[PDB]
Amino acid sequence: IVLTQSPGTLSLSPGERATLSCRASQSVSSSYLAWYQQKPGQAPRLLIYGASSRATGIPGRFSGSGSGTDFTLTISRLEPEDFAIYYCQQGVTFGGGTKVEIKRTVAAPSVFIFPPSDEQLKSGTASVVCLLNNFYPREAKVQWKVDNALQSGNSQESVTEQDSKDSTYSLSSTLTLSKADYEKHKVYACEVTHQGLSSPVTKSFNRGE
Amino acid sequence: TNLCPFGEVFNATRFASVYAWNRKRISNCVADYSFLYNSASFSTFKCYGVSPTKLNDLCFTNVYADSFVIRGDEVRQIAPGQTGKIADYNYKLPDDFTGCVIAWNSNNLDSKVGGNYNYLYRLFRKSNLKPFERDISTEIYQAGSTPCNGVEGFNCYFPLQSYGFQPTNGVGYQPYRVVVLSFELLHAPATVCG
Amino acid sequence: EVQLVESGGGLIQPGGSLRLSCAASGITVTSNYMSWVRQAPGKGLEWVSVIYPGGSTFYADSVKGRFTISRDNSKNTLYLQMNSLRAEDTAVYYCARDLVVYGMDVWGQGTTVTVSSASTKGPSVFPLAPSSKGTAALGCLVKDYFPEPVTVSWNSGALTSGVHTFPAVLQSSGLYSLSSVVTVPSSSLGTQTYICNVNHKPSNTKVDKRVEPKS
Ligand SMILES: *[C@@H]1O[C@H](CO)[C@@H](O[C@@H]2O[C@H](CO)[C@@H](O)[C@H](O)[C@H]2NC(C)=O)[C@H](O)[C@H]1NC(C)=O
Known part of the structure; x- marks a missing residue:
């Protein structure tokens, strides 16, 4: 049994209706499904059992429906505390989760690039950091370029949770090179693609100023 | 001839729930197991402690025919040594079982719309x-x-x-009618012979 | 009150063993389907194991032969013995009461299991210097520490507006790295000192790094 949740992310405003889908690879029993909510750092919380029955103390705006293979969780009128991840479950199987996030207007990131510090260079490694600040939606592409060569396999990135004040995301990417490799090249650039940008934005520096 | 009424078990129009499984005690009759070798009618036919092809040559003190409905994916629990909700809480075979387990898909009789x-x-x-x-x-x-x-x-x-x-359940979750034949050999004259 | 209180998580090397405990109040462990469910960092929920009221046990394929679920009625406690642990067993482990047809209604608070061959190590803290080219960004790179977590403040807590402290990444070395940044007025760079305060309790490391425009 495989449970497939859709969409991966719902972007909605408070007061709007949320509809989350869980599809089972097989029709098992009837109305055989539970729904859970999970907030960061907290354990899951049972919302719905038997596909349509509300767990005790769950607000009435939560409802479940469906049967056979197609099930729906509906939050009729989203409250701010409802933005969270939601899982469906049947037997020992969990769906992959659906995130309900706050919708806001598109905001392009502010992009900043940081060379490695001399202190770090003394130790034999160079970390180059690219910062994408306060953007929406969450999808964004960072392409590292060294002397215009597109870098693959030597970077890692991290994204903040949605900001509680302005509902944006921020992203940090680190390109890691050996000192020797770093000293072999001149132009270090991060090129950022995002819906808020009519064309990609590149921030760069030349090693050694 | 005085045939054992296996037809009353296998061909019953209605079957019991597994928790309230039915039992028919078969005594003092001639048992013809030929209907078991009619294939394309049974999805499971597994014997334990007896040869499945030699049943017509055997004598027993009594024979028990238990019957009930479970899910397809639960038929594997109707065997010696198994665990799970059915074996643990509904119908349990002994570890030293002597008999046969027969099952067939009953979706056409036992499932309902909704x-x-x-x-x-x-x-x-x-x-x-x-x-x-x-x-x-x-x-x-x-x-x-x-x-x-x-x-x-x-x-x-x-x-x-x-x-x-x-009826639109996946086949593994469709209803299966199950009959369990237990062959009882006591230190006593046999009364059910092939 | 109805609760499940978990304990026993911690840091363990690959091949080692840990025992998790889940002390119950308000439900009787031996009367219930009781499960362990885990959640690896940033991932979804994964069922691990169940013990039935009558005592039958079942396991996910990924832990079969390595984990053993058990229970103690007099302590009203559920246990998970985890042997031959592997890196990919790193997760938050939850215990839960499973009503099977009525969902998993009661959950423990979770206990964290980290499986790694890395040694405890304080971070190196490097400046992310505000560019010379009006909002400026600056920050600290907190690199090569183990285990989680580190905490980062700015100016001893006096600077909170505009701070983003990012989730750490696990590097191929087995050590973590994170960055903390803040956006400030460019006109403040000449007159305001910016210091990141990094604390790594597991190694008793505290580092205050002044971040200034480079020259
Ligand atoms: C259940 O009923 C079927 C059909 O009435 C029986 O199958 C018949 O068995 C006789 C011999 O006893 C054959 O001559 C027929 O050709 C069979 N018909 C079909 C359609 O298979 C079956 O024997 C019964 N099951 C029992 C008695 O256990």
Whole structure:
């Protein structure tokens, strides 16, 4: 049994209706499904059992429906505390989760690039950091370029949770090179693609100023 | 001829829920097992402690024919040595079982649009059944330290649950009729012979 | 009150063993389907194991032969013995009461299991210097520490507006790295000192790094 949740992310405003889908690879029993909510750092919380029955103390705006293979969780009128991840479950199987996030207007990131510090260079490694600040939606592409060569396999990135004040995301990417490799090249650039940008934005520096 | 009435078990129009599994005790008759070798009628035919092809040559003191409905994916629990909700809480074969287990898909008879809620299984029981034990209690199941006093609520659950048999279920979750033939050989004259 | 209180998580090397405990109140462990469910960092929920009221046990394929679920009625406690642990067993482990047809209604608070061959190590803290080219960004790179977590403040807590402290990444070395940044007025760079305060309790490391425009 495989449970497939859709969409991966719902972007909605408070007061709007949320509809989350869980599809089972097989029709098992009837109305055989539970729904859970999970907030960061907290354990899951049972919302719905038997596909349509509300767990005790769950607000009435939560409802479940469906049967056979197609099930729906509906939050009729989203409250701010409802933005969270939601899982469906049947037997020992969990769906992959659906995130309900706050919708806001598109905001392009502010992009900043940081060379490695001399202190770090003394130790034999160079970390180059690219910062994408306060953007929406969450999808964004960072392409590292060294002397215009597109870098693959030597970077890692991290994204903040949605900001509680302005509902944006921020992203940090680190390109890691050996000192020797770093000293072999001149132009270090991060090129950022995002819906808020009519064309990609590149921030760069030349090693050694 | 005085044939054992296996037809009354195998060809019964209605079958029991597994928790209330039926038993017919077969004695003092000639048993013709030829209907078992008619294939394309049975999805499961497994024997233990006897040869499946030699049944017509055997004599036993008595034969028991137990019958019930379970899910397809639960038929594997009707075997010696198994665990799971059915083997543990509904119908248990002994480890030293001597007999045969026969099953066939009964989707056409036992599933209903929107769910057939007449076939039940026991979900909650504090301990496993002994072999060939039949528990028909409907007492409210106490899952905490507070007595239930006969009313459902938190930690107080009705112990039986319905299968949701609908005809569009995946085959592994469709209803299967099961018959278990137990061959009893006692230190006594045999009364069921092939 | 109805609760499940978990304990026993911690740091363990690959091949080692840990025992998790889940002490129950308000439900009787031996009367219930009781499960362990885990959640690896940033991932979804994964069922691990169940013990039935009558005592039958079942396991996910990924832990079969390595984990053993058990229980103690007199302590009203559920256990998970985890042997031959592997890196990919790193997760938050939850215990839960499973009503099977009525969902998993009661959950423990979770206990964290980290499986790694890395040694405890304080971070190196490097400046992310505000560019010379009006909002400026600056920050600290907190690199090569183990285990999680580190905490980062700015100016001893006096600077909170505009701070983003990012989730750490696990590097191929087995050590973590994170960055903390803040956006400030460019006109403040000449007159305001910016210091990141990094604390790594597991190694008793505290580092205050002044971050200034480079020259
Ligand atoms: C259940 O009923 C079927 C059909 O009535 C029986 O199958 C018949 O068995 C006789 C011999 O006893 C054959 O001559 C027929 O050709 C069979 N018909 C079909 C359609 O298979 C079956 O024997 C019964 N099951 C029992 C008695 O256990």
